[PDB]
Each structure stands twice: as C-alpha cells, then as structure tokens.
From a paper:
Pac13 is the only monomeric, metal‐free cupin dehydratase characterised to date.
Mutants E108Q, K16R, H42Q, Y55F and Y89F were produced and purified, affording diffracting crystals of the same morphology and space group as wt Pac13, which raised our confidence that the mutants folded correctly and that the effects seen are specific to interactions with each mutated residue rather than global effects on protein folding and structure. In the H42Q–uridine complex, the critical interactions between 5′ OH and Y55 and Y89 remained the same as in the WT‐uridine structure, additionally the hydrogen bond between K16 and E108 with 2′‐OH, as well as the π‐stacking of the uracil ring with F103 are all preserved. Q42 appears to have the same distance from the 4′ proton and the overall fold of the protein does not seem to be impacted, all of which suggests that the H42Q mutation affects the key catalytic step and not substrate binding.
Numbering used by the authors: 2 to 121
Write the structure that this text describes.
Amino acid sequence: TKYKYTVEESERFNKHGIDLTVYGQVDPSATVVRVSVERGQFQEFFNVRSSYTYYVVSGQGVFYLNSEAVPAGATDLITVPPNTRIHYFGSMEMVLTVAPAFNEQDERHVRFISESESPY
Ligand SMILES: O=c1ccn([C@@H]2O[C@H](CO)[C@@H](O)[C@H]2O)c(=O)[nH]1
C-alpha cells in the first residue's frame, strides 16, 4: 500500500501562470496538490462538481470568486464551492484540495485573463 507520495515522484507542470505539483495519489474523495504562483492564474474557470480549497502557505494575493475580490495571506483558508468562477492574482505558495477528486472534464473554461491585469 503506497501511502506516501513525494515531489520527486510527482507530475510538475505550468498551467495558465501557475506551477502545479500533482502527486498522482488516487482517492475518489479528494485530490491534494501544491500550487506555486508568481503573478497569477490567468484563466477563469468553474468546476461543476468539486469544491476547491486553497490553504495559503506563504505570500499574499487576491482571489476573484464570481468576480468578487477576496484578499488572501499566509495561513488563510479560501474555500470555493462548485459552480463558482475562479481566478486569482498573487505571489503565493498554496496547498489545494479538490473534493471530490479532481476530474478535468468537470472544469468549464470561462475566459483568459490578461497578464497585465495582475498587480503582482
Ligand atoms: O489535480 C489537479 C488539481 C488542480 N489542477 C489545476 O489547478 C488550478 C487550481 O487553481 C486549476 O487550473 C486546475 O485545473 C490541475 O490541473 N490538476
């Protein structure tokens, strides 16, 4: 039984301005990944099934949740329910929980965001 997953073993890639570490643990109830962001996620999406919960390890930023600004700093917990439009700006390290388990097909692209819109 493989309980532990390391960064060394993970899939690491850039998507829409963020750096993701996807450990590749399989569990139907939740997917937990690491997010590093220097300026922002320059894409707005919503997920029809899963809540996205961001724990801010370090840094600061601002989430836009159905266009509402939600400031965030280190140790804050940002919980986004399904069917909520999400993008964000900031310089942050985060732990993201997608529950139930992340499925890319549950995601709906709304728009791209201009890289100049980020004040970070
Ligand atoms: O397993 C996961 C979890 C999250 N994300 C992406 O991480 C971002 C979280 O803001 C979104 O673009 C979401 O699609 C993935 O690509 N895979």
